[PDB]
Amino acid sequence: GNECPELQPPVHGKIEPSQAKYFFKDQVLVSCDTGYKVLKDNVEMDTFQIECLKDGTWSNKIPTCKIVDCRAPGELEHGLITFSTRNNLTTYKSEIKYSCQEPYYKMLNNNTGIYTCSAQGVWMNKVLGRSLPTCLPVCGLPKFSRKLNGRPAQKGTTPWIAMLSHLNGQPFCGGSLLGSSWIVTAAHCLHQSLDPEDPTLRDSDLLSPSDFKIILGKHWRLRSDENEQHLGVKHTTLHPQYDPNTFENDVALVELLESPVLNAFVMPICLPEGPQQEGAMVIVSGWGKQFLQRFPETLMEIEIPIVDHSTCQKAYAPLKKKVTRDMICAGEKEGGKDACAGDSGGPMVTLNRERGQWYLVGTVSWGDDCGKKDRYGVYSYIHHNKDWIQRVTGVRN
């Protein structure tokens, strides 16, 4: 030998140790700059080692430096990936952009959604870092308009209402879609009538996810739509302080087994962000006979004002029925037939201007027999238990 030829550092790389002349048994590591790695026969490596042989030749040839590949970006549920070039580059320094599926979803915290391929082969966002953005369900924004009591509801104007039916489709309660997977309803909808001689709620009384289903995007009471989504039930949670005899905290939460596809006919209703006032106008909807002579063919609605707590209590006091602070009343005049509005668990909503958003004020309560509640319509004051609901479902407006 015994000297080996001068070595050429690869592009975007280097060689160590850097000697003026190399002689037998000398060794060198070939490495690459930040964002690049050594490429030897399609195997990536931090360094590759060469040595000077006795005959004066190097053990191998200088490999090359290949740019790092962040590979395929993480999937954003309800979101979209938009590359910053027509070639969809997933390599070092390249960028992509996450966008939520408008208008049915919006990005949480309005994160830029921009991710860059880092030197360590990971897509990184300035704020979240490695974590992906969150696409939230847009609530209370109906896509169909209102033509402008008692009256059949216009198709598409109540995309949040849920029908709690038997496995065959027979309704027995109402409900509202919250977030992506939750149905808020009345606690007394989720258990069989208790024994008058032993009025205590027990687990066997509760009905199971196998006993009923949820139907969304439904307009006709008995007829079928193409918009109807029949979903199975996963689990149910009645309010911890639900009293089936006084109907205190008569609110419950149904976790759907599979989530509905959000569209022009199926969207969640917004949670309350503040208490309601006396005289405030609300809308109550349902499929029951309600204030009608006979059962309707389509969903029904009625715009009625809120009644101040006190006046309600006073009207029910002579009947030994205590209207608790977790309850809200509505209607026009006591015994005015509009105290029978809605189905148990059904929604009571109102408009938040100029937010142009609808939100849930209460759920129909005190049972499905209006004779036992003819003074005023009593509902589970959602505002009162917003914390528990938000705590359990993890839902945000």
Contact present, 287 and 365 (Cβ < 8 Å) = no
Q: For residue 382, give the DSSP letter.
A: G
Domain boundaries, the chain: 1-67, 68-144, 145-158+269-381, 159-268+382-397
Does the domain spanning 1-67 belong to CATH 2.10.70.10?
Answer: yes
CA 124/CA 328 separation, integer angstroms: 48
Task: For 22, list phi and psi in degrees, rounded to 5.
Answer: -110, 140
Q: How far is CA 373 from CA 151, 283, 325, 329, 365, in A?
A: 21, 19, 17, 11, 10
Catalytic residue among 165, 181, 250, 326: 250
Catalytic residue among 31, 180, 188, 326: 188
SS3 (DSSP) at 338: coil
Q: What is the dihedral of CA 191, 195, 200, 204, to 10 degrees?
A: -50
CA 254/CA 212 separation, integer angstroms: 11
Does the domain spanning 145-158+269-381 belong to CATH 3.60.70.12?
Answer: no
Catalytic residue among 344, 365, 368, 380: 344
CATH number of 159-268+382-397: 2.40.10.10
CA 99/CA 236 separation, integer angstroms: 33
Element (H, E) at 392: helix 386-393
Q: For residue 104, give the DSSP letter.
A: T
The reply to whether 68-144 and 159-268+382-397 are identical in fold is: no
- Number of Cβ within 10 Å of residue 139's Cβ equals 22
Q: What is the CA radius of gyration of the chain?
A: 32
Question: Does the annotation count 188 as an active-site position?
Answer: yes
Determine the distance from the C-alpha atom of residue 324 to the mean position of all C-alpha atoms in its chain, rounded to a whole number.
31
Q: For residue 383, give the DSSP letter.
A: G
Give the count of alpha carbons within 13 A of 374, CB side only.
6
Determine the distance from the C-alpha atom of residue 377 to the mean position of all C-alpha atoms in its chain, rounded to a whole number.
30
Burial of 385 (0-12, 13-18, 19+ CB in 10 A): buried
Q: How far is CA 52 from CA 28, 49, 60, in A?
A: 9, 10, 9
Question: Does the annotation count 94 as an active-site position?
Answer: no
Say which experimental method was used.
Answer: X-ray
CA 14/CA 182 separation, integer angstroms: 58
Looking at the chain, after which residues does the C atom sit over 2.5 Å from the next written N, breaking the chain?
A: 148
Element (H, E) at 223: none
| Per-residue buried b or exposed e for 35-53, using 16+ beta carbons within 10 Å of the residue's own CB | bbbbbeeeeeeeebebebe
DSSP per residue over 189-213, as a string?
A: GSBPPPBTTB----TTTBPPTTTEE
Supply 12's token pair.
């975007």
Direct distance between the N- and C-terminal alpha carbons of the chain, in angstroms, rounded to an integer? 77
For residue 51, the cross-strand partners are 27
Q: What is the β-pairing status of strands 27-32 and 79-83?
A: unpaired
Question: Does the annotation count 198 as an active-site position?
Answer: no
CA 171/CA 156 separation, integer angstroms: 20
CATH number of 68-144: 2.10.70.10
Q: How far is CA 335 from CA 101, 275, 280, 293, in A?
A: 47, 25, 19, 16
Give every CB contact of residue 177 below 8 A, 6+ residues apart in sequence.
Answer: 160, 161, 162, 183, 216, 260, 266, 267, 268, 269
CA 247/CA 373 separation, integer angstroms: 12
For residue 302, the cross-strand partners are 284
The data reach a resolution, in angstroms, of 2.5
For residue 255, the cross-strand partners are 182, 235
